[PDB]
Structure formats: C-alpha cells, structure tokens
Amino acid sequence: MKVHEIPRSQLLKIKQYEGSFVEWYRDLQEDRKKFASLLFRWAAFGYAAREDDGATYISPSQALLERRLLLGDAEDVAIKFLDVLFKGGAPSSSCYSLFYEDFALRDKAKYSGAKREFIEGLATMPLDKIIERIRQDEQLSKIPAEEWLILGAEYSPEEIWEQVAPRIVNVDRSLGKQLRERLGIKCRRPHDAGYCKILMEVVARQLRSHNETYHEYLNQTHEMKTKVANNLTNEFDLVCEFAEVLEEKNYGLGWYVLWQGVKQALKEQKKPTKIQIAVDQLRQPKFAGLLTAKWRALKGAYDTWKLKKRLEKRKAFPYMPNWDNDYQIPVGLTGLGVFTLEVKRTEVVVDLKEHGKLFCSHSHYFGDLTAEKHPSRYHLKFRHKLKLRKRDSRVEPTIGPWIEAALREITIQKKPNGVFYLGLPYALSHGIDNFQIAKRFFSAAKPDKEVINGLPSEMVVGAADLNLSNIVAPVKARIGKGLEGPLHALDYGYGELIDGPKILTPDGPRCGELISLKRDIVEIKSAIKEFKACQREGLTMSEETTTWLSEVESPSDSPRCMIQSRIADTSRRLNSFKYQMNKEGYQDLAEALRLLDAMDSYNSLLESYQRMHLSPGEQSPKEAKFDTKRASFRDLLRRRVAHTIVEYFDDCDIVFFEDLDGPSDSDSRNNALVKLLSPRTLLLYIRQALEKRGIGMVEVAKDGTSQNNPISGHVGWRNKQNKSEIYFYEDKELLVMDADEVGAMNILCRGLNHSVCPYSFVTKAPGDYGKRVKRFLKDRYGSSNVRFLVASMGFVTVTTKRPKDALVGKRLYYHGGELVTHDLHNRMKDEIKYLVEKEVLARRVSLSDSTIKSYKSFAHV
DNA sequence: AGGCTTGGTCTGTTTGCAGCCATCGACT
C-alpha cells in the first residue's frame, strides 16, 4: 500500500558538550550571521532600513546601485548563480562549491536512475513520447533529438553513455568555484566538507524564505491598486472627501456610524446625535450628493476606502531581516554532516566524527525509546509516559502506545538563556489513503471518476461544532454503498449513524461563579475612572458603586483602599482556584476556559491600577516583563483540546469541522473565539494531532451551519438569550433542539455534500460563481446559466430562459429544496420568532432518533 | 456617567515564504 510520512519534532535538553564543538557552533552562527547580510544585496531586494526614527525607503535602483559597485566582474555570473540558487530543491546539486576550497569537479554527469531507463528502450520509443520526456529535463535538451535518435538505432544501450556525460553536464555547478577566487571569499574553516555543505544550504534556507515573499509582497501592491481604482464611483468621489475635512477638525469615520446620519438629516431633527459633525457636514451641498445613495452600492464603496487606507500605511518594500538571532542548524545522514547516536544509561549521546561528541538527558516524551540503525534511516520505537513527581502516589503513569517510525536528521539551537537544545524531526509511516481521499474527494466539488472508485465499501466520519460554550459536540457515523440510511452523501451513497451527536465537555461547575467573578472585575474597570474623573472635576463618588465597595471586610471606609480590598479579595479568588485546579492538571477545559478569560481580565485590570495616579497627559511605558505564562498557557489549552477531540475520533478515518475564519456574517469581529483561541490554530492543532494518527481532516463552510435544520432544512432561531437552544417550525408543530448539537449535524451534512449545497450567494446576468456553487444549479435545476424570478407568495423560481424582468445582483437563502429570497428569509425567521414570543409549547426532538427516515438538509435528489 | 473617531506606546493574534535528503563514482 502507499504510505506518507509526517514531520514532527520534540525537544531534548542538552547538558554537556565535549570537544571543539563550542567554537564550532559559534563559528556557524557567525559565518551564517556574517554573509547573510551581504547576500541580501545581490538579488537587489528593495528594503527599508529599520530605524527608531522611521524606516528608510531604499528602492531596487538604490540597491542595484551597489550591486555593480560591490562586484565589478562577478555580476555577469552571479545573476546566473542566484537563479540556479533560487530554484533550489536539489537540482542545484552542488551550490556549496564556492565555500569549499578543495572543491573538485568531475568531467562526467552522474548516471541518474531516470537517465538509465531512457537508453535501453531507445530503439522503439515513439517520438511523441521521446520528446515529452526530454523537454521537461534540464540536462537532456542540450543535445537536440537528432543525434539522440541516431544512437538509439545503431548502438546498443551500454556504449552510448560513455560519450554523452561530458556533454549533458549542468555547467552551473562550476559557478561556485569561480566566485571564491574572483571574490577572495574565505570562510572560517575550509577543508571541512561538513562545515561548508551545511552552511551553504543553511544560509540558502534562510534566504529563499525571503525571495518568494518579495515577489508576493509586491504582487499585492499590484492587486491592491487594481481593486481601489476599479470601484471608483461617483460615490467614492465624495466618500473620501468626508475623511479629509474630518481629520482637520480632529475626528474620524467608522462603519456603523454611517446609517444614523441620513435618517436624522432627512427629517428636520434639531437635536443632534453622536455624529452631528457628520450631519452638519451632511447638510452642506457638497455632501448632499451622498444622502441619496443606494442600499448595497455603498458597502462596495466602504471597503475600497477601508482598503485604500491600507495601501497608504503599508511600506513600499520589506524590512531588512535581522540575522543576529540563532537559527536552527540541521544536520542529516547522507551528504551533509555526519553523526551517530546512542542511548547511554538511558541518557542520550550524540557523536559527530570530526568535531567531537555532545551529551544528552533522559526525556519523558520518549519514555521507552529504542534505536536500531538501518543503512539509510534510524528506526525508533517508543511511547509517551507521564511526568512522575510523586514517589509513593497510588497514581499510575499514563502509558502511551508504541510508535514505529523513521528518523534521518537532527536539529540544534541555542536559546536566549544560554542552553543548547536538540531536536528530533521524525517521520511517521502511516497510511496515505485517508489523506489521499481527504483532499481529492471531500474537499472539492467533483473528483474524476477514476478517483471516486478509490474507496473501500465502508468508512467512518465525524464532526463537531465549537463555540465558547460547551466546546465539543461530536457525531460518529457510518457511510455505505450497500447500506441504506437517512443521510445522503454525494457519490458514495447513504449512511446510518453509530453514535452522537452529544456534547462531551459540558461547562463545568466552577464556571458559574467565575463568570460571577468576571463581573466583579467588570465593575472595577468602570469604577477606577470614577476616582479619576472626580479628581479632575471636583465632585464626589456615586453611592451605587460605593455601596458595592463596602461589601468587603475593609478596616477603612476610605474610597481608595476599599477598591484595593475588592481586588485583593479578587486576586485571592484567582490565586486560590489557581491552586485547587493546579492539583488536577486542568482536566476540565470548559472550567479553565472561563478561568482563562478570568486570568485575562485580572491582568487587564492591573494595567489600570498602575495608571490610576497619572495626571492627564503623562503615561507609563509598560515594558515587557516577558510574562512566560500567558503565552505558553493559552497554547496548552489548545494542545489540550486535541486530547479531548482525538480520544473520541481515534477510530474515525476522516473528521470535519467548522472553519470560523472565512466569509462569516457581521457579528464575527467582536466574537470572543477569534479573540480567545485561534480557530485555525485550534483546527490545525487538531490536524497535527489527527495527522499523527493517519486520520484526514477536511474543513467545510461556516455560513449558517448552526442556523439550518438537519431534518427539514427550514430555518431556526438561535435564542438570543439562551444560545444553547434553537427552535424550528415544521408540520404545523413547533419543535426545539440544541444549537451546538444542531451544528454538528449540519457540518456532517455539508461534509458529505462536498460543501456544494449553498446557504447564500449573489446573482449575476447570464462576475461568475465559484466551482463549488455550480454543481448545485446543474444537478437540480438543469444548468449554470440561469436567471431567477420572483413568483407567487414571494418565492424564487429558476427559469431555463434568460429574461431581463427578473432580479439580478441580489441575495438568497436555501431551505428544504426551495430557493427563497431575503425578504422571505426574514419572514421565515419571523414565523418562528413570533410563535415563541406568544408563549406556546414546543416539542424537543433529539437527533439520536430512528423515526427519522432521511435528513433533508444539504441534499438534492 | 457613557459612546465613538484620531494617534502614540506596549504585548498578543493569525498567516505564507523557506525544511525535516537519496545516489553514483572515486577511492579504502
């Protein structure tokens, strides 16, 4: 079967070093360091020079100046050298040649494997297959197919090679040797192939990381000045004229500031609102051409101004990369540096043959590690144990499973504390089938039919919905060609469900009073300004905030110190529950979550008590205390969300998730999840722990997955006071279920639909739809080039003719099979919204039921 | 008391570049 390896690495703290290495490391982080800032100029990279006063703005012409002013003669070769260096990969086979002083060349090109296969079948190979092999080969075109053909007919295969190798050689490999002598280039060590071979690719490994950014950072400047001057309307002609006369008067302009300006200026309103400076400038004649603008044609003139102002804050070219910080030095078995390795008294040892031996410590991640050398790879076998602090604890150390893997190179780094670490970039022999199916089959709209036939009969899926509430609600399922069932999967068949959907981490107990503890910090932020706003006016304080302050046993009624006792009593609460949760190791994520935010508002509060005394206009330059906690903690919770999500998804082959970082609706900027814990870092941290077990992961859209009904597709209402419940109107009977459960089904639904079944899209006139939108209109109604008609009851119809009466350039919603419009999707929400308000009784419907024959959401048949 | 816009200073958050080497030929 086909396998695919997965790159991972975990630390190893080095204790002692032996030999001349210490100088050796310091030389590479000085040889790298030394020449990287010189090679910067050779490709003429336009660079800002970092400075406290600003950033100087050097241009390519101001940098191409010193290219020939630094190399008068190597220029005509260096440009050929940089390309054969920027291509990289390995066909640049020996770029190290310039550093190595004894660099020898051979007069023959090497006998490559693909260079052998081409000669023995030179007699019969067709020219419409001979020329498609060589055209794409760097060494083969240099001889035209004429003299290629003659040797195949006359000569037996083995004789031909003896006379073509000095002809098809890649003459770029000499470019390195010339530059050293013509430039007087000396490194620190020069007969040492290791020192050279590593350093060449190492500096290159840091440089190519800058070239592709360079042409990509630029190609944005070419796409940004295209999409600012493509939407210049007579509405842009006066929208930016609004901010010019706003900054002179010392003001600015926002987004939701926009809609209450014309509604108060279209009826004589003599009592201003928060935007009177706009309303008084929305009564002048030069901005009276703005009050009369349309509905949607102004959202497409707000983004350009919100896009143009990003063109002006952006620098014209990248900064200069700072190279002083130590880089992760890699050393590999074959070709690069040479190393051997052992486990000495369960303590790791590393040996480098020319330059002496490192020393190493016993590690917990590799708990029962073993090593056996094979000629190309190291084979490791180990498991994960726990970390053993207590000696007479009844507590067994958690045993991980054994891991069979391969390892071929090692990494080294100094940390700012002066410690040398050692890394192990290891590869995992795992089945590629799950990944192979993941990208090609579920991600995309239509896979080729030779790919669809790459499926076994039955396989397992999963999904969940994650919001800040009770985070994980999974559902496992079974999909089958043979087996019939209630969920429709595109191109694979029907499926029937094993477990789920259930919530797995319900919000723990201590949360209820920790939010109640957050409110205690909520009032301290608004109250500290009351001590600071009456210091400027001369007034006293409000009793309602004062009455709250007295709730503490405070030995002084002074307003100042009672503030401090509500906070010391608050810090103790955080200090205490810190301890009693540290006992556990944080086994309830849902608990630590509302605690994490509680740890946030406390640190967010101490920055206003240090700045209480400050008279108006003098600040405190709060410095980095390199709080190591808040950074390396909120990571731990994410790498702990894996364990609860992996445990329930081990037996699955594929997983699905809600990608909350995509084109979402408007309420997702203030949302805490983009603020509290990264979606993609969490989804990727799941992927990294899912890839580890050879289980594919494929995201799907985030557009209204919580909203739709899994059974009937009809709309629902996420209760605006209780986000955990959601309501539905079907069959003249009201129903209710759990929202963050509902989302798990709609993600499982949309997953088996390849995200094809849409939620909302924008019309045009038969500006094209994406390839994932097409397969819906073609499969159901008949084609892609279709206009849409408003019809009886205010529905929408798909017409196979293309008339001009119809609505074009608008927006829709999809429910149960019917294409409905926007003024109806409000009405449809309005249908449930009113029934709940009138205090009617609904019927809860679990989705674990068997009475359901088929789920009709995101399926078309 | 609260509700935005502007800017500065400081960390913190979310991304796409580079990478995780095999094989012959000369020589022991």
Next chain:
DNA sequence: AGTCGATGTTCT
C-alpha cells in the same frame, strides 16, 4: 565490503 565527496527530478 565500506566511506565520504559530489551529483540527480517536475506534476498541481
């Protein structure tokens, strides 16, 4: 047999 230098590819 074995070491270490120097050399080899191409689709999205």
Next chain:
RNA sequence: GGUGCUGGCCGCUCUCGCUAGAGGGAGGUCAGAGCACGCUGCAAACAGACCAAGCC
C-alpha cells in the same frame, strides 16, 4: 527522566495613597500532579490593552 503551568511565607525593590492598604518584578524560600506536548528562523496584516483631546 527536557520545555509548560500554581498558590503561601520571607524580605528586597518599584508605583500610587482620604493612610487604610494594594499592585507589580527578576531571583533566595514553604506546598501540588490522572497535564498535554511540532521543535525552529525570516517575513507581513489585524486586533487586543492604557493615557490625551475634540465632538454628540
């Protein structure tokens, strides 16, 4: 048995202060383990947090 994460106590220092106290910060010190673990360099865009004004 490598990196994380935690509270008391001690002083030390720092900041304010209706005088009551609080809050930091790198280390010296008393307590707790059913806690997961892709390491790393260059780069770029937002948002988050506090002091200032004008404005309704």
